[PDB]
Every structure is written in C-alpha cells, then in structure tokens.
Nucleic acid binder design. Structure first.
Length: 149
DNA sequence: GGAAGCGAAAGTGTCGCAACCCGAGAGAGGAACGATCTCGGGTTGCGACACTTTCGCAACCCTTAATACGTTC
C-alpha cells in the first residue's frame, strides 16, 4: 500500500519503486563539513531518487508532533524558541547524545505502537519498505545496523 | 566502525642473588690424632623486572551531495 501511494505521488510504477527500495539504505553520499573551531562533522545525504521518495513519504503520512517541539516546524523557529524563555530568570539547558544516530527502526516502530495521537496504520508487509525509505546503513557488511541520518 | 601503529594496564615467568647446608681438608692443642675454620659445590626462597596479552585511540567517508546570502539542529 505504501508503494502504491508513493508510485501515485511520484508518477512511477509500483515495480520501479519497489526495485529502487531494495538497496535504498545504501544510497547515501558521505562527506565532511568543517566545524567553526577545528575539525569536521560527517554528513550522509541520500541520493536524489531516494530524497524524492522520502519527501513523498512525509507528504503522504502525517505523524504527530508536540507543540514544545520548535525545530523543523512550519512557521516556528529559533526566535520562537528563545522567546518562550525570555521572561524567566532561571535557565536550564540539556542535550541528548547522538540524537539522530540513536533512532533505530526498533525505536520507530515502538513509538508507532505506543503513540496516543492518531498514528497512520501500516500493514506488516509495508514495514520493511518503510525501514528502507527512512533509515541509512552506514556499514556495508552489517545489514542489521540501520539508523537515522 | 575501526586502518596502522602505538602504548597503558595488567597478569605471568625468569633468573640472579642471599642465606643456608654439607663434606673435604690442613693440621691447633701439644706429641696422638684430628680442633677450628675456610674452600667449593649444591639447594631453596624471594622479589624485581622482563615478557606477554588485551584494549582502544580514530585514518577513511564507501557509486550514490549541492552550490543567492544569513541563522539554528
């Protein structure tokens, strides 16, 4: 079903979407961006074909997001985030470690299962395709390690 | 995640020294052997240190990226 939806949006055949997705987790270009002090960050960008599929997926399936989440939200940004705290005198900042690379298919599916608000329902057959759409395989030899980039 | 080279940490084995034991031997005391002391060789316990083994830092960025200027993750 996910495949049919994507094929319709991208005006492609079910077969060509399915074929592309077989090795989608490996279709990432890896490069370095300089840090502002010394050193580099390593970035993995999906190939163009995969980016299109990923955008289509996000368009087709609305996942719930809390109002406290300020990043990547339409009409919100760093100004809104800062303004939320401007009237208070005491401040605490905390950070999550390796945030994106900590999110695995296992976490994703657990969150789907646990979620209070109306999550899209996926057929078991679609779960494998979704994993291939959303998660990157950093290590060629280790097919079992999929993470968000 | 983890190349290649490197060294920290930690466990094990080696080996040389000191202390001890043993029998051999020249020959004090005084006039018959053999007292006392030292040579030379062997054993055993000890502990400092050499040797061995494992771990972990982080090169590379995989065929697969985009290019109007800034900010944030």
């Amino acid at each position: 079903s996910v495949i049919r939806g994507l094929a319709a949006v991208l005006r492609q055949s079910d077969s060509d979407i399915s074929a592309f997705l077989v090795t989608a987790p490996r279709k990432y270009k890896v490069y370095k961006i300089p840090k502002r002090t010394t050193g580099f960050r390593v970035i993995a960008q999906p190939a163009k074909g995969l980016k299109d599929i990923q955008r289509a997926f996000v368009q087709l399936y609305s996942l719930p997001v809390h109002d406290a989440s300020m990043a990547y939200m339409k009409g919100k940004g760093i100004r809104d985030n800062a303004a939320a705290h401007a009237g208070n005198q005491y401040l605490l900042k905390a950070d999550l470690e390796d945030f994106f690379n900590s999110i695995t298919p296992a976490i994703f599916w657990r969150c789907i299962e646990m979620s209070s608000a109306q999550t899209p329902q996926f057929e078991p057959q679609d779960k494998l395709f979704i994993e291939k759409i959303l998660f990157w395989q950093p290590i060629k030899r280790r097919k079992t390690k999929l993470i968000l980039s």
